Design an enzyme around this catalytic site. Structure first.
Site, PDB file in Angstrom:
ATOM      1  CG  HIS A   1      -2.934  -1.148  -2.230  1.00  0.00           C
ATOM      2  ND1 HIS A   1      -2.784   0.002  -1.484  1.00  0.00           N
ATOM      3  CD2 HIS A   1      -3.249  -0.745  -3.485  1.00  0.00           C
ATOM      4  CE1 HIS A   1      -2.987   1.052  -2.258  1.00  0.00           C
ATOM      5  NE2 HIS A   1      -3.274   0.628  -3.476  1.00  0.00           N
TER       6      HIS A   1
ATOM      7  CG  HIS B   1      -2.923  -3.649 -10.129  1.00  0.00           C
ATOM      8  ND1 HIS B   1      -4.148  -4.211  -9.842  1.00  0.00           N
ATOM      9  CD2 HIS B   1      -2.846  -2.515  -9.393  1.00  0.00           C
ATOM     10  CE1 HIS B   1      -4.788  -3.446  -8.973  1.00  0.00           C
ATOM     11  NE2 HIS B   1      -4.019  -2.410  -8.684  1.00  0.00           N
ATOM     12  CG  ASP B   2      -1.749  -2.792  -6.123  1.00  0.00           C
ATOM     13  OD1 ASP B   2      -0.715  -2.095  -6.292  1.00  0.00           O
ATOM     14  OD2 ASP B   2      -2.946  -2.411  -6.130  1.00  0.00           O
TER      15      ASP B   2
ATOM     16  CG  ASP C   1      -5.239   1.042  -9.274  1.00  0.00           C
ATOM     17  OD1 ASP C   1      -5.549   0.122  -8.496  1.00  0.00           O
ATOM     18  OD2 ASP C   1      -4.225   1.749  -9.111  1.00  0.00           O
TER      19      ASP C   1
ATOM     20  CD  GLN D   1     -11.651   9.705  -1.267  1.00  0.00           C
ATOM     21  OE1 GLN D   1     -12.282   8.933  -1.978  1.00  0.00           O
ATOM     22  NE2 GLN D   1     -10.326   9.746  -1.259  1.00  0.00           N
TER      23      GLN D   1
HETATM   24  C1  LIG Z   1      -0.501   6.962  -0.546  1.00  0.00           C
HETATM   25  O1  LIG Z   1      -0.111   7.737  -1.676  1.00  0.00           O
HETATM   26  C2  LIG Z   1      -0.054   9.136  -1.372  1.00  0.00           C
HETATM   27  C3  LIG Z   1       1.414   9.519  -1.188  1.00  0.00           C
HETATM   28  C4  LIG Z   1      -0.656   9.957  -2.517  1.00  0.00           C
HETATM   29  N1  LIG Z   1      -1.866   9.421  -3.106  1.00  0.00           N
HETATM   30  C5  LIG Z   1      -3.024   9.039  -2.483  1.00  0.00           C
HETATM   31  C6  LIG Z   1      -3.832   8.571  -3.491  1.00  0.00           C
HETATM   32  C7  LIG Z   1      -5.139   8.014  -3.378  1.00  0.00           C
HETATM   33  C8  LIG Z   1      -6.220   8.590  -2.745  1.00  0.00           C
HETATM   34  C9  LIG Z   1      -6.319   9.856  -1.982  1.00  0.00           C
HETATM   35  N2  LIG Z   1      -7.341   7.813  -2.948  1.00  0.00           N
HETATM   36  C10 LIG Z   1      -6.943   6.785  -3.677  1.00  0.00           C
HETATM   37  C11 LIG Z   1      -7.716   5.632  -4.162  1.00  0.00           C
HETATM   38  N3  LIG Z   1      -9.083   5.443  -3.949  1.00  0.00           N
HETATM   39  C12 LIG Z   1     -10.043   6.507  -3.648  1.00  0.00           C
HETATM   40  C13 LIG Z   1     -10.862   6.123  -2.420  1.00  0.00           C
HETATM   41  O2  LIG Z   1     -11.503   4.857  -2.625  1.00  0.00           O
HETATM   42  C14 LIG Z   1     -10.534   3.823  -2.830  1.00  0.00           C
HETATM   43  C15 LIG Z   1      -9.704   4.114  -4.076  1.00  0.00           C
HETATM   44  N4  LIG Z   1      -7.070   4.700  -4.852  1.00  0.00           N
HETATM   45  C16 LIG Z   1      -5.726   4.834  -5.114  1.00  0.00           C
HETATM   46  C17 LIG Z   1      -4.982   5.867  -4.700  1.00  0.00           C
HETATM   47  N5  LIG Z   1      -5.599   6.861  -3.959  1.00  0.00           N
HETATM   48  C18 LIG Z   1      -3.101   8.743  -4.674  1.00  0.00           C
HETATM   49  N6  LIG Z   1      -1.901   9.270  -4.445  1.00  0.00           N
HETATM   50 MG   LIG Z   2      -0.632  -0.126  -6.759  1.00  0.00          MG
HETATM   51 ZN   LIG Z   3      -4.240  -1.166  -7.202  1.00  0.00          ZN
END
Ligand SMILES: CO[C@@H](C)Cn1cc(-c2c(C)nc3c(N4CCOCC4)nccn23)cn1
Ligand SMILES: [Mg+2]
Ligand SMILES: [Zn+2]
Length: 312
Positions: free
Chosen positions: A68, A106-107, A217, A269
């Site tokens: 991020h 946004h971050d 995003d 994933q």
């Molecule tokens: C860290 O937040 C956790 C509590 C739950 N969470 C994890 C996610 C998450 C996951 C598994 N993969 C992504 C994600 N990506 C998918 C993998 O390539 C990079 C972008 N982006 C944003 C949030 N993501 C969304 N919600």
């Molecule tokens: Mg964010």
């Molecule tokens: Zn973001």
């Protein structure tokens, strides 16, 4: 310094495509945002010194966390640019202005900690911001920068328009709370299938803008597989550092944030793509058909994860 940058000609052609990776152009990212602003909003939207002062200030307020970070800001902005371009008419000037600044901001000031963490282990930010904890703090950080000396890129707009654009932005940033996304999609899929989705309806609009932000995003899953692989390494590092702090306070994290359970990531994933990405870009292709290449890419990357699952 920034202000006499001129984008390479080979990059002028490729920045328009969806799959474009900013990754290997680190020093050109500020000037690629400026270029992208000018191309979508025109050369005269903001005063150059105001924009460049702001663009660099934003960069300063992004930390050196593994995902991020400044790179992720420019990545998500690019993908917005591409969507706006392929669907220019649908959106107003003030929306184009705001969404690109939104995606870029946004971050702002992420630490590598989910909302979930900040809330559980009772932190100030969760104190001030009850829900969408970080996503609020990001919008706050946006305005503190917008209100620095010479930084107010919007000052040539009326009060009326300054407070419209800031709304657009607030809405957008907040909507990148992936928690809010899931309910948004379902409404759109329904509003779509029931023949009732009306871009003219302001409330319908904000939902689509919302879906757009989540398409943007997440757009790392829409790039060529090696880039996608390498990016997951970056988030999971961030996720793992988080999971370690739950371990150092005697709490097992979910497998996702446990570095010891990295075997399961491929299935993680595989779910995330099925539960989130594929549906995300599938509702988006229905609403904005010129964004189809994003769903195309998502699918290719799904089968790569599926391939990795079965020993390949
Ligand atoms: C860290 O937040 C956790 C509590 C739950 N969470 C994890 C996610 C998450 C996951 C598994 N993969 C992504 C994600 N990506 C998918 C993998 O390539 C990079 C972008 N982006 C944003 C949030 N993501 C969304 N919600
Ligand atoms: Mg964010
Ligand atoms: Zn973001």
């Amino acid at each position: 310094g920034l202000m006499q940058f001129t984008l390479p000609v080979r990059l002028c052609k490729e920045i328009e495509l969806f799959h474009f990776d900013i990754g290997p152009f680190e020093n050109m990212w500020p000037g690629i945002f400026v270029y992208m602003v000018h191309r979508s909003c025109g050369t005269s939207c903001f005063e150059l010194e105001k924009l460049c002062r702001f663009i660099m200030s934003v960069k300063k307020n992004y930390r050196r966390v593994p995902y991020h970070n400044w790179k992720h800001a420019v990545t998500v902005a690019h993908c917005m640019y591409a969507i706006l371009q392929n669907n220019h008419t649908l959106f107003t000037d003030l929306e184009r202005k705001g969404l690109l600044i939104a995606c870029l901001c946004h971050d702002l000031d992420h630490r590598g900690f989910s909302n979930s963490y900040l809330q559980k282990f009772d932190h100030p930010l969760a104190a001030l911001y009850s829900t969408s904890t970080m996503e609020q703090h990001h919008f706050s950080q946006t305005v503190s920068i917008l209100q620095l000396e010479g930084h107010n890129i919007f000052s040539t707009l009326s009060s009326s328009e300054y407070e419209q654009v800031l709304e657009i932005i607030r809405k957008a940033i907040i909507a990148t709370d992936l928690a809010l996304y899931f309910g948004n999609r379902k409404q759109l899929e329904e509003m779509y299938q029931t023949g009732s989705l009306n871009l003219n309806n302001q409330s319908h609009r904000d939902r689509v803008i919302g879906l757009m932000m989540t398409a943007c995003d997440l757009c790392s899953v829409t790039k060529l597989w090696p880039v996608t692989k390498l990016t997951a390494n970056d988030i999971y590092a961030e996720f793992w550092a988080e999971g370690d702090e739950m371990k150092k306070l005697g709490i097992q994290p979910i497998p996702m944030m446990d570095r010891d359970k990295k075997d399961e990531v491929p299935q993680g994933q595989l779910g995330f793509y099925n539960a989130v990405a594929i549906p995300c870009y599938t509702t988006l292709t229905q609403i904005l058909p010129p964004t189809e290449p994003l769903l195309k890419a998502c699918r290719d990357n799904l089968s790569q994860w599926e391939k990795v699952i079965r020993g390949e």
